[PDB]
Amino acid sequence: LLAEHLLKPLPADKQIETGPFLEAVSHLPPFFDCLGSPVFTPIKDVISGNITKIKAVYDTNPAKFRTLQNILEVEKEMYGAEWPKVGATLALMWLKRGLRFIQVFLQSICDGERDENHPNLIRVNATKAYEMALKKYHGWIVQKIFQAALYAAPYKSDFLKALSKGQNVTEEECLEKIRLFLVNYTATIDVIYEMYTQMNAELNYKV
Amino acid sequence: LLAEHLLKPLPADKQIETGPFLEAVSHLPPFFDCLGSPVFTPIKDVISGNITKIKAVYDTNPAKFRTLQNILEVEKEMYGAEWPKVGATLALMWLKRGLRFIQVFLQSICDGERDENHPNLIRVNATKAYEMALKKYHGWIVQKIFQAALYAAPYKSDFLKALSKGQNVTEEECLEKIRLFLVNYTATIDVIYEMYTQMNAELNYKV
Ligand SMILES: CCCCCCCC/C=C\CCCCCCCCCCCCCC(=O)N[C@@H](CO[C@@H]1O[C@H](CO)[C@H](O)[C@H](OS(=O)(=O)O)[C@H]1O)[C@H](O)/C=C/CCCCCCCCCCCCC
Ligand SMILES: CCCCCCCC/C=C\CCCCCCCCCCCCCC(=O)N[C@@H](CO[C@@H]1O[C@H](CO)[C@H](O)[C@H](OS(=O)(=O)O)[C@H]1O)[C@H](O)/C=C/CCCCCCCCCCCCC
Q1: Nearest ligand to the C-alpha atom of residue A137
Q2: Does A110 sit in the ligand 1 pocket, CB within 6 Å?
Q3: Measured distance CA(A188)–CA(B118) in Å, rounded
Q4: Is B151–A145 a contact, with Cβ atoms under 8 angstroms apart?
Q5: What is the total count of domains within chain A?
Q6: What is the CATH number of the domain that holds A62?
Q7: Burial profile B130-162: b = 16 or more Cβ within 10 angstroms, e = fewer
Q8: C-alpha distances in angstroms, A111 versus A108, A170, A187, B117?
Q9: Measured from the CB, is residue B146 less than 6 Å from ligand 1?
Q10: Residue B3: inside a domain, yes or no?
Q11: Does A206 reside within a domain?
């Protein structure tokens, strides 16, 4: 149930408190265990791992790492020339990309983007999310692994069904709750991308 | 370095002490982080997860769960009709299959099985291991994911190189240490398979 854990709104100064953020996004990886296939469990674990790494660094000193901007600027100072490919900065660099993937996927579904010829699939939505969020950073083996995983994707009706877990709500109602979640989720992700740009903390290497 | 953590020999009564076993096989999953690609990290984590689950159950009562046979017979009693698809029995059911995969792969390399036309690849060895250990239990998406991952497989020379980490030893020496490790490793795995048969604890479902 996405809109039961809305993200906070951005404050005027656009600084994101680390503790609240981590707590919010930590409700996202489990969803990957209700998409119908064990092919997604490794994906839960990849995104959780990013979250766990940021929390581990935050837990060393919450006041020093109070906001996400604090994390980047502090680690830049701590690590010198190995930064930004170290620590929580690297974990959040990759986290923002998974989060962005989810954002683009959910927004595509809610904007009614679909394959007219195969309308209860979610493949076009996942393929667009992947091209926007992830593909730039994956070598061809991983891109092939994505293309294989796409076939385990559930039908759209089943996917919406699992997002409400059985609430007996119309798809229309379901999509409206998703639109609501997307408000502060997109705004937050955009601010994390903008901070990576302003700090020159973004790297373009492929895996 | 495989032969620095040899498995114990089997005792006369062919009972495998749980603590020692777990400690031994826990040196195996890290190796997946030195094969040259992030495609294997999810694999480290899948096998570690099986090991972690068995240890978690063992830690509740070491004396009740002293041997692997103890685990199966105790859980059969604890869980009734959900057994063998529960608890440490299910974790070890899947563990033995990963361990068997590694065994068949290493033994194939050491027996000189190779593609004459592509002699410094390890693909035929991985494909045989997969067919012997795993394929029976994978649906076609996962089989496709395996076929994609096969392309991240290192060259044989690099793989042997990483097993000695840089020891300046001939491949011949390397393979002889692997043959030595394989003695008590194969014997132990075979006893775990035989216990699954004798207990009727083996399930054939696909993922
Ligand atoms: C709430 C709604 C849910 C929305 C989702 C519904 C979608 C359903 C639709 C379609 C299904 C199709 C598949 C969808 C795929 C979903 C993708 C979600 C986003 C995933 C994000 C992946 C990010 C990524 O590429 N990561 C990559 C980079 O990770 C980072 O690497 C860094 C070093 O360069 C660091 O190590 C870093 O670690 S840390 O310590 O700094 O934290 C670490 O996190 C990571 O390598 C890729 C992971 C994906 C797995 C690819 C490999 C799979 C191998 C499979 C092998 C199996 C073969 C075995 C056969 C028996
Ligand atoms: C020391 C020497 C090292 C030797 C290895 C060198 C090999 C190098 C050669 C070639 C490389 C080619 C790939 C090689 C593959 C190696 C395979 C190693 C053995 C792996 C064993 C897999 C076992 C397996 O199939 N497991 C399956 C069943 O697991 C069990 O499921 C149970 C329920 O039915 C339980 O949940 C159970 O959990 S527990 O709680 O009870 O413990 C759990 O462990 C498991 O589903 C399969 C895992 C493999 C990953 C497949 C999915 C990958 C998805 C990738 C998605 C990425 C897409 C994202 C794109 C951005």
Answers
A1: 1
A2: no
A3: 51
A4: no
A5: 1
A6: 1.10.3520.10
A7: bebbbeeebeebbebbbebbbebbbebeebbbe
A8: 5, 16, 17, 52
A9: yes
A10: no
A11: no
